């Protein structure tokens, strides 16, 4: 199938960032204003009311009024709010655990997840509905936060175990569906890939892990000569948006895999790799004529402004590669639950 089909999970506690080293850095290192701005605010999470899971069938309206672009369905947002709160709190607690090392944040995360697990949340839905997508985002969000505390001894370990098993079932069920002519292969495929990768790690499920790495391999084969993703260039006014969107899960799969000794960044297909796609995002934002080759609509550029969660992937890549912030977007801190919370907090290092 692919070059990583014998890969195994070596360390289920390794997470998607070196938690101990990063914490040490946050507590002893010379922080700039940006990093200080990114420190999460402590609070007493033991008294906080967290979202309750939906009873029974997960029903979520379609996102787009019609098609896969244009105006948004007015019924969508009020419904996915519950999920976005679940995501926000999760990622916030994970980041607080990393920054402070206090077990209380871990216990808070586990109590919320345990409640969702006991309800069999994220399991009952129509695979052809919007719900199937919502699961890929919410399950990865939770897993990323949980992955940072897999080594913590001061928690209810039995509860930690039920939650991991639940996540494993969620991801196995969610990724068992192939998708359509697009969702088999487009950014959704990559999002399922990040889900399978991180949950495969924390649950020591080699097969889920391999399936997730396979999604990254699939993506590299769908990059045009210019660095554009084939399926993202069919989205009309959201083409540029979706080109960027695709980078989010691809980057987390690569970051997660590097903690298990795999270097997905180095992987390429016919001389094309993730760096080509980065270069194209940067170029096309400076010069949107580039997109005209694929779409004639004026591009929606809501994702391209300082502080947008959509830019979180830049935090991880620039930490690792050292390239230049050519668009001048890395000013304020970035926070995105679906890619592990604040990549500023977790990856960004000030530069001499």
Ligand X SMILES: O=C(O)C1=C[C@H](O)[C@H](O)[C@H](O[C@H]2[C@H](O)[C@H](O)[C@H](O[C@H]3[C@H](O)[C@H](O)[C@H](O[C@H]4[C@H](O)[C@H](O)[C@H](O)O[C@@H]4C(=O)O)O[C@@H]3C(=O)O)O[C@@H]2C(=O)O)O1
Residues in the site for ligand X, rule: CB under 6 A?
Answer: 63, 68, 133, 186-188, 245, 302, 307-309
- Nearest Cα to 250, choosing from 197, 205, 208, 177? 197
CB of 336 to ligand X, least distance (A): 6
CB of 332 to ligand X, least distance (A): 10
Dist CA 327 CA 341 (whole Å): 22
Dist CA 186 CA 180 (whole Å): 10
**148: number of Cβ within 10 Å:** 28
Separation of CA 98 from chain center: 17
Q: Which is nearer to ligand X, 169 or 308 (CB)?
A: 308
CB of 187 to ligand X, least distance (A): 5
Q: Which is nearer to ligand X, 292 or 302 (CB)?
A: 302
CB of 188 to ligand X, least distance (A): 6
Q: Which is nearer to ligand X, 242 or 267 (CB)?
A: 242
Residues in the chain: 352
CB of 303 to ligand X, least distance (A): 7
β-bridge partners, 341: 336
CB of 307 to ligand X, least distance (A): 6
87 in Cβ contact with 139 (< 8 Å):
no
Q: Which is nearer to ligand X, 28 or 66 (CB)?
A: 66
Q: Which is nearer to ligand X, 302 or 349 (CB)?
A: 302
Rounded to 5, what percent of the chain is helix, strand, coil?
55, 0, 40
Cβ within 8 Å of residue 284, ≥6 positions away: 228, 240, 243, 290, 291
Q: Which is nearer to ligand X, 133 or 316 (CB)?
A: 133
Q: Which is nearer to ligand X, 63 or 162 (CB)?
A: 63
CB of 21 to ligand X, least distance (A): 27
DSSP 114: H
Q: Closest residue to ligand X, Cβ-based?
A: 309
- Nearest Cα to 251, choosing from 233, 277, 231? 277
């Amino acid at each position: 199938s692919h070059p990583f089909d014998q890969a195994v999970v070596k360390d289920p506690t390794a997470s998607y960032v070196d938690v101990k080293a990063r914490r040490t850095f946050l507590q002893s290192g010379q922080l700039d204003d940006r990093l200080k701005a990114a420190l999460p605010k402590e609070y007493d999470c033991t008294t906080e009311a967290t979202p309750n899971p939906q009873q029974g069938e997960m029903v979520i309206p379609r996102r787009y009024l019609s098609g896969n672009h244009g105006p948004v369905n007015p019924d969508y947002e009020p419904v996915v709010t519950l999920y976005r709160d679940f995501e926000k709190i999760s990622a916030t607690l994970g980041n607080l655990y990393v920054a402070t090392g206090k077990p209380v944040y871990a216990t808070c995360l586990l109590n919320m997840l345990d409640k969702w697990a006991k309800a069999d949340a994220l399991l009952n839905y129509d695979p052809k509905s919007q719900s199937w997508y919502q699961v890929e985002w919410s399950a990865a969000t939770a897993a990323f936060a949980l992955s940072t505390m897999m080594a913590e001894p001061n928690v209810d370990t039995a509860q930690r175990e039920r939650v991991v098993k639940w996540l494993n079932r969620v991801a196995r069920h969610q990724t068992s569906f192939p998708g359509g002519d697009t969702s088999c292969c487009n950014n959704h495929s990559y999002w399922r890939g990040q889900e399978a990768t991180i949950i495969g790690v924390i649950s020591k499920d080699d097969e889920l892990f391999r399936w997730g790495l396979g999604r990254y391999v699939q993506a590299m084969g769908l990059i045009n000569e210019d660095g554009s993703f084939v399926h993202e260039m069919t989205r009309h006014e959201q083409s540029l948006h979706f080109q960027n969107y695709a980078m989010l899960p691809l980057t987390m799969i690569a970051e997660t895999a590097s903690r298990q000794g795999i270097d997905l960044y180095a992987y390429k297909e016919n001389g094309r790799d993730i760096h080509s796609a980065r270069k194209f995002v940067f170029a096309a934002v400076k010069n949107p004529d580039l997109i005209k080759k694929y779409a004639s609509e004026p591009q929606d550029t809501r994702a391209f402004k300082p502080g947008r969660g959509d830019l979180n992937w830049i935090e991880y890549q620039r930490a690792r590669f050292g390239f230049a912030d050519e668009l001048g977007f890395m000013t304020v801190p970035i926070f995105d639950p679906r890619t592990g919370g604040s990549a500023t907090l977790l990856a960004y290092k000030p530069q001499g």
